[PDB]
Protein backbone atom coordinates (compact mmCIF):
# COMPACT_ATOMS: atom_id res chain seq x y z
CA UNK A 1 0.00 0.00 0.00
CA UNK A 2 0.93 3.68 -0.24
CA UNK A 3 1.85 4.73 3.28
CA UNK A 4 0.90 8.33 4.08
CA UNK A 5 2.83 10.02 6.91
CA UNK A 6 2.00 13.45 8.31
CA UNK A 7 4.13 15.86 10.28
CA UNK A 8 4.03 17.20 12.94
CA UNK A 9 1.54 15.07 14.97
CA UNK A 10 0.41 18.32 16.58
CA UNK A 11 1.32 21.94 16.61
CA UNK A 12 0.36 24.87 18.81
CA UNK A 13 -0.62 28.10 17.11
CA UNK A 14 -2.40 31.41 17.65
CA UNK A 15 -4.99 33.23 15.58
CA UNK A 16 -3.17 34.93 12.72
CA UNK A 17 -0.26 32.49 12.53
CA UNK A 18 1.03 31.07 9.28
CA UNK A 19 0.79 27.30 9.65
CA UNK A 20 2.39 24.63 7.46
CA UNK A 21 1.55 20.89 7.59
CA UNK A 22 3.41 18.21 5.63
CA UNK A 23 2.43 14.85 4.09
CA UNK A 24 4.76 12.27 2.53
CA UNK A 25 3.82 9.21 0.49
CA UNK A 26 5.86 6.03 0.20
CA UNK A 27 5.37 5.95 -3.61
CA UNK A 28 4.85 8.80 -6.11
CA UNK A 29 1.16 9.77 -6.32
CA UNK A 30 1.96 12.61 -8.38
CA UNK A 31 -0.91 15.03 -7.66
CA UNK A 32 -3.69 12.71 -6.48
CA UNK A 33 -3.78 14.10 -2.96
CA UNK A 34 -6.66 15.47 -0.86
CA UNK A 35 -6.62 17.47 2.36
CA UNK A 36 -9.43 17.19 4.93
CA UNK A 37 -10.44 19.14 8.05
CA UNK A 38 -12.20 17.51 11.05
CA UNK A 39 -13.62 18.96 14.24
CA UNK A 40 -14.30 16.55 17.15
CA UNK A 41 -17.64 14.80 16.76
CA UNK A 42 -18.11 15.99 13.16
CA UNK A 43 -17.58 14.49 9.72
CA UNK A 44 -14.40 15.52 7.86
CA UNK A 45 -14.61 18.29 5.26
CA UNK A 46 -12.59 18.47 2.06
CA UNK A 47 -10.30 21.48 1.75
CA UNK A 48 -8.13 20.65 -1.25
CA UNK A 49 -8.21 18.06 -4.04
CA UNK A 50 -5.60 17.40 -6.73
CA UNK A 51 -3.19 18.64 -4.04
CA UNK A 52 -3.50 22.32 -5.08
CA UNK A 53 -7.13 22.90 -6.02
CA UNK A 54 -9.15 24.76 -3.43
CA UNK A 55 -12.55 23.26 -2.93
CA UNK A 56 -15.67 25.35 -3.43
CA UNK A 57 -16.55 27.48 -0.43
CA UNK A 58 -13.25 26.84 1.36
CA UNK A 59 -11.75 30.23 2.33
CA UNK A 60 -8.74 31.36 0.33
CA UNK A 61 -6.38 31.30 3.33
CA UNK A 62 -6.02 27.55 2.64
CA UNK A 63 -3.56 26.46 -0.04
CA UNK A 64 -1.83 23.24 -0.95
CA UNK A 65 1.35 22.59 -2.91
CA UNK A 66 3.53 19.69 -3.95
CA UNK A 67 3.63 16.78 -6.36
CA UNK A 68 5.21 13.36 -6.42
CA UNK A 69 5.75 12.31 -2.80
CA UNK A 70 5.99 15.55 -0.76
CA UNK A 71 2.95 17.70 -0.09
CA UNK A 72 2.22 20.80 1.94
CA UNK A 73 -0.91 22.34 3.40
CA UNK A 74 -0.58 26.02 4.34
CA UNK A 75 -2.97 28.23 6.29
CA UNK A 76 -1.92 31.83 5.69
CA UNK A 77 -3.71 33.41 8.66
CA UNK A 78 -5.18 30.99 11.19
CA UNK A 79 -8.78 31.63 12.24
CA UNK A 80 -10.58 30.15 15.26
CA UNK A 81 -12.48 27.64 13.10
CA UNK A 82 -9.16 26.26 11.88
CA UNK A 83 -8.20 24.57 15.19
CA UNK A 84 -8.97 20.99 14.16
CA UNK A 85 -7.39 17.75 13.00
CA UNK A 86 -6.11 17.72 9.42
CA UNK A 87 -5.76 14.58 7.29
CA UNK A 88 -4.07 14.01 3.97
CA UNK A 89 -5.41 11.29 1.68
CA UNK A 90 -4.01 9.85 -1.53
CA UNK A 91 -6.54 9.26 -4.33
CA UNK A 92 -3.97 7.68 -6.64
CA UNK A 93 -4.69 3.95 -6.26
CA UNK A 94 -6.48 1.40 -4.07
CA UNK A 95 -6.40 0.91 -1.16
CA UNK A 96 -7.17 4.58 -0.49
CA UNK A 97 -5.04 5.65 2.47
CA UNK A 98 -5.06 8.55 4.93
CA UNK A 99 -2.24 10.16 6.81
CA UNK A 100 -2.33 9.81 10.56
CA UNK A 101 -3.52 13.34 11.29
CA UNK A 102 -2.14 16.67 12.48
CA UNK A 103 -3.88 18.39 15.39
CA UNK A 104 -3.68 22.17 15.25
CA UNK A 105 -4.27 23.31 18.84
CA UNK A 106 -4.55 26.67 20.58
CA UNK A 107 -1.34 28.01 22.12
CA UNK A 108 -1.52 29.66 25.54
CA UNK A 109 0.66 30.26 28.56
CA UNK A 110 2.04 27.36 30.59
CA UNK A 111 -0.12 26.07 33.47
CA UNK A 112 1.14 23.29 35.69
CA UNK A 113 -1.54 20.76 36.69
CA UNK A 114 -3.26 20.80 40.06
CA UNK A 115 -3.21 17.17 41.24
CA UNK A 116 -5.92 15.44 43.29
CA UNK A 117 -6.14 11.82 44.42
CA UNK A 118 -9.37 9.96 45.26
CA UNK A 119 -9.61 6.67 47.18
CA UNK A 120 -12.02 3.92 46.14
CA UNK A 121 -15.46 4.33 47.65
CA UNK A 122 -16.56 1.97 50.39
CA UNK A 123 -19.52 0.92 48.23
CA UNK A 124 -17.26 -0.15 45.36
CA UNK A 125 -14.92 -2.00 47.72
CA UNK A 126 -17.69 -4.30 48.95
CA UNK A 127 -18.17 -5.35 45.30
CA UNK A 128 -14.61 -6.73 45.13
CA UNK A 129 -12.84 -4.04 43.04
CA UNK A 130 -10.90 -0.90 43.94
CA UNK A 131 -10.55 2.04 41.53
CA UNK A 132 -8.13 4.73 42.70
CA UNK A 133 -8.37 7.93 40.65
CA UNK A 134 -5.75 10.63 40.10
CA UNK A 135 -6.75 13.94 38.48
CA UNK A 136 -4.39 16.35 36.71
CA UNK A 137 -6.52 19.46 36.30
CA UNK A 138 -6.27 22.46 33.98
CA UNK A 139 -2.76 22.16 32.59
CA UNK A 140 -0.95 23.33 29.47
CA UNK A 141 0.82 22.16 27.41
CA UNK A 142 -0.50 18.67 26.89
CA UNK A 143 2.61 16.58 27.66
CA UNK A 144 2.59 15.09 31.17
CA UNK A 145 3.63 11.97 33.06
CA UNK A 146 1.67 10.33 35.88
CA UNK A 147 3.07 7.31 37.75
CA UNK A 148 1.44 5.15 40.43
CA UNK A 149 3.34 4.00 43.52
CA UNK A 150 1.80 1.51 45.97
CA UNK A 151 3.94 1.13 49.11
CA UNK A 152 6.60 2.81 46.91
CA UNK A 153 6.45 0.06 44.25
CA UNK A 154 5.98 1.49 40.76
CA UNK A 155 2.89 0.05 39.08
CA UNK A 156 2.68 -1.13 35.49
CA UNK A 157 -0.16 -2.45 33.36
CA UNK A 158 -3.02 -1.80 35.82
CA UNK A 159 -3.93 1.81 34.98
CA UNK A 160 -5.75 3.64 32.17
CA UNK A 161 -5.45 7.33 31.34
CA UNK A 162 -7.98 9.63 29.73
CA UNK A 163 -7.75 13.25 28.53
CA UNK A 164 -10.20 16.05 27.73
CA UNK A 165 -10.17 18.24 24.66
CA UNK A 166 -8.80 21.74 25.12
CA UNK A 167 -11.23 23.59 27.37
CA UNK A 168 -13.60 25.88 25.48
CA UNK A 169 -12.87 28.79 27.85
CA UNK A 170 -9.23 28.57 29.04
CA UNK A 171 -7.65 26.19 26.46
CA UNK A 172 -6.26 23.86 29.15
CA UNK A 173 -6.33 20.08 29.37
CA UNK A 174 -7.35 17.78 32.17
CA UNK A 175 -6.38 14.14 32.56
CA UNK A 176 -7.51 11.21 34.69
CA UNK A 177 -5.43 8.14 35.61
CA UNK A 178 -7.37 5.21 37.10
CA UNK A 179 -5.62 2.41 38.99
CA UNK A 180 -7.71 -0.76 39.29
CA UNK A 181 -7.03 -3.58 41.76
CA UNK A 182 -8.92 -6.44 43.36
CA UNK A 183 -10.27 -5.81 46.84
CA UNK A 184 -7.80 -8.35 48.21
CA UNK A 185 -4.83 -6.62 46.55
CA UNK A 186 -5.98 -3.14 47.61
CA UNK A 187 -6.29 -4.11 51.29
CA UNK A 188 -2.67 -5.34 51.47
CA UNK A 189 -1.19 -1.89 51.07
CA UNK A 190 -1.09 1.36 53.01
CA UNK A 191 0.20 4.20 50.84
CA UNK A 192 -1.37 4.99 47.47
CA UNK A 193 0.53 7.74 45.65
CA UNK A 194 0.13 9.55 42.34
CA UNK A 195 3.35 11.17 41.03
CA UNK A 196 3.15 13.83 38.32
CA UNK A 197 5.60 15.68 36.11
CA UNK A 198 4.95 18.50 33.66
CA UNK A 199 7.18 21.09 32.02
CA UNK A 200 5.59 23.75 34.24
CA UNK A 201 6.62 21.90 37.46
CA UNK A 202 10.09 22.44 38.93
CA UNK A 203 9.94 19.01 40.62
CA UNK A 204 7.44 16.12 40.52
CA UNK A 205 4.17 16.59 42.41
CA UNK A 206 3.02 13.70 44.60
CA UNK A 207 -0.48 13.27 46.05
CA UNK A 208 -1.21 10.30 48.30
CA UNK A 209 -3.50 8.78 50.91
CA UNK A 210 -3.08 6.01 53.49
CA UNK A 211 -5.70 3.28 53.06
CA UNK A 212 -7.35 2.58 56.42
CA UNK A 213 -6.74 6.06 57.86
CA UNK A 214 -9.01 9.06 57.50
Amino acid sequence: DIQMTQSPSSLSASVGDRVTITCRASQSIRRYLNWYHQKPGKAPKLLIYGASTLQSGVPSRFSGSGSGTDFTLTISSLQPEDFAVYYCQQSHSAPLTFGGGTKVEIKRTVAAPSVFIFPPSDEQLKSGTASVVCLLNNFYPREAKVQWKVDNALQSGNSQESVTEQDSKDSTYSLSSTLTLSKADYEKHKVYACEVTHQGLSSPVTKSFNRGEC
Binding site: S12, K107, Q199, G200
Partner: protein, 120 residues
Protein backbone atom coordinates in the same frame (compact mmCIF):
# COMPACT_ATOMS: atom_id res chain seq x y z
CA UNK B 1 26.55 17.47 31.58
CA UNK B 2 26.73 20.72 33.57
CA UNK B 3 24.96 24.07 33.32
CA UNK B 4 26.03 27.62 34.07
CA UNK B 5 23.78 30.67 33.93
CA UNK B 6 25.30 34.09 33.38
CA UNK B 7 24.18 37.59 32.52
CA UNK B 8 22.47 38.43 35.78
CA UNK B 9 22.98 41.85 37.27
CA UNK B 10 21.41 45.01 38.61
CA UNK B 11 19.11 46.95 36.27
CA UNK B 12 16.61 49.79 36.64
CA UNK B 13 12.88 49.19 36.05
CA UNK B 14 12.19 49.17 32.33
CA UNK B 15 15.71 47.97 31.56
CA UNK B 16 16.91 44.78 29.95
CA UNK B 17 19.14 41.79 30.66
CA UNK B 18 20.20 38.87 28.46
CA UNK B 19 20.62 35.58 30.31
CA UNK B 20 22.55 32.67 28.86
CA UNK B 21 22.63 29.05 29.97
CA UNK B 22 25.63 27.13 28.63
CA UNK B 23 25.75 23.33 28.77
CA UNK B 24 29.22 21.81 29.12
CA UNK B 25 29.40 18.15 28.11
CA UNK B 26 26.87 16.19 26.06
CA UNK B 27 24.94 17.94 23.28
CA UNK B 28 21.52 19.26 24.35
CA UNK B 29 19.95 20.00 20.96
CA UNK B 30 17.43 17.16 21.27
CA UNK B 31 16.17 18.25 24.73
CA UNK B 32 13.95 21.10 25.84
CA UNK B 33 15.52 23.76 28.03
CA UNK B 34 13.55 25.62 30.66
CA UNK B 35 14.09 28.73 32.75
CA UNK B 36 12.85 28.97 36.35
CA UNK B 37 13.22 31.74 38.92
CA UNK B 38 13.24 31.81 42.72
CA UNK B 39 12.75 35.04 44.66
CA UNK B 40 13.81 35.11 48.32
CA UNK B 41 11.33 33.19 50.44
CA UNK B 42 9.05 32.21 47.55
CA UNK B 43 8.58 28.95 45.67
CA UNK B 44 10.62 28.18 42.56
CA UNK B 45 8.45 29.10 39.56
CA UNK B 46 8.29 28.48 35.82
CA UNK B 47 9.51 31.17 33.39
CA UNK B 48 9.93 29.75 29.88
CA UNK B 49 10.75 26.72 27.79
CA UNK B 50 12.49 26.38 24.44
CA UNK B 51 11.64 22.96 23.01
CA UNK B 52 13.65 21.50 20.12
CA UNK B 53 13.93 23.94 17.22
CA UNK B 54 10.61 23.87 15.39
CA UNK B 55 8.72 22.58 18.44
CA UNK B 56 7.97 26.04 19.83
CA UNK B 57 8.62 28.30 22.82
CA UNK B 58 6.28 28.42 25.82
CA UNK B 59 5.99 31.09 28.51
CA UNK B 60 4.54 31.78 31.94
CA UNK B 61 1.79 34.38 32.36
CA UNK B 62 4.08 36.73 34.28
CA UNK B 63 6.69 37.05 31.52
CA UNK B 64 4.58 36.72 28.39
CA UNK B 65 5.44 39.44 25.88
CA UNK B 66 8.52 40.67 27.76
CA UNK B 67 10.87 37.66 27.77
CA UNK B 68 12.00 35.69 24.72
CA UNK B 69 13.71 32.32 25.06
CA UNK B 70 15.83 31.08 22.17
CA UNK B 71 18.59 28.54 21.52
CA UNK B 72 21.93 28.23 19.73
CA UNK B 73 22.53 24.52 19.06
CA UNK B 74 26.01 25.29 17.67
CA UNK B 75 26.94 26.77 21.07
CA UNK B 76 24.98 24.26 23.25
CA UNK B 77 23.38 27.34 24.81
CA UNK B 78 19.91 28.72 25.57
CA UNK B 79 19.17 32.42 25.96
CA UNK B 80 16.53 34.32 27.91
CA UNK B 81 16.17 37.87 26.59
CA UNK B 82 14.44 39.86 29.35
CA UNK B 83 12.98 43.22 28.30
CA UNK B 84 10.76 45.64 30.25
CA UNK B 85 12.10 44.34 33.55
CA UNK B 86 9.96 44.92 36.66
CA UNK B 87 10.94 44.99 40.36
CA UNK B 88 8.89 41.78 40.78
CA UNK B 89 11.27 40.10 38.31
CA UNK B 90 14.02 40.14 40.99
CA UNK B 91 14.97 36.50 41.62
CA UNK B 92 17.70 33.96 41.07
CA UNK B 93 17.18 32.52 37.58
CA UNK B 94 17.89 28.87 36.82
CA UNK B 95 17.97 26.76 33.66
CA UNK B 96 17.22 23.05 33.49
CA UNK B 97 17.16 20.31 30.83
CA UNK B 98 14.04 18.26 30.37
CA UNK B 99 15.69 14.84 30.14
CA UNK B 100 12.50 13.50 28.51
CA UNK B 101 12.58 13.82 24.72
CA UNK B 102 8.77 13.67 24.81
CA UNK B 103 8.61 16.88 26.93
CA UNK B 104 6.94 15.63 30.11
CA UNK B 105 9.21 17.73 32.36
CA UNK B 106 11.94 15.49 33.78
CA UNK B 107 14.24 18.22 35.14
CA UNK B 108 17.22 16.24 36.45
CA UNK B 109 20.05 18.61 35.51
CA UNK B 110 20.04 22.17 36.89
CA UNK B 111 22.38 25.13 36.74
CA UNK B 112 23.59 27.01 39.79
CA UNK B 113 21.61 30.20 39.16
CA UNK B 114 22.27 33.83 38.25
CA UNK B 115 21.00 36.75 40.31
CA UNK B 116 18.61 39.28 38.75
CA UNK B 117 17.76 42.45 40.71
CA UNK B 118 15.51 45.22 39.37
CA UNK B 119 15.47 48.43 41.43
CA UNK B 120 15.88 52.20 41.16
Amino acid sequence: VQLQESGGGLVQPGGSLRLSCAASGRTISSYAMSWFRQAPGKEREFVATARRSGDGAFYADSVQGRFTVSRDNAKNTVYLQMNSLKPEDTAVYYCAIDSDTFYSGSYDYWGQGTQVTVSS
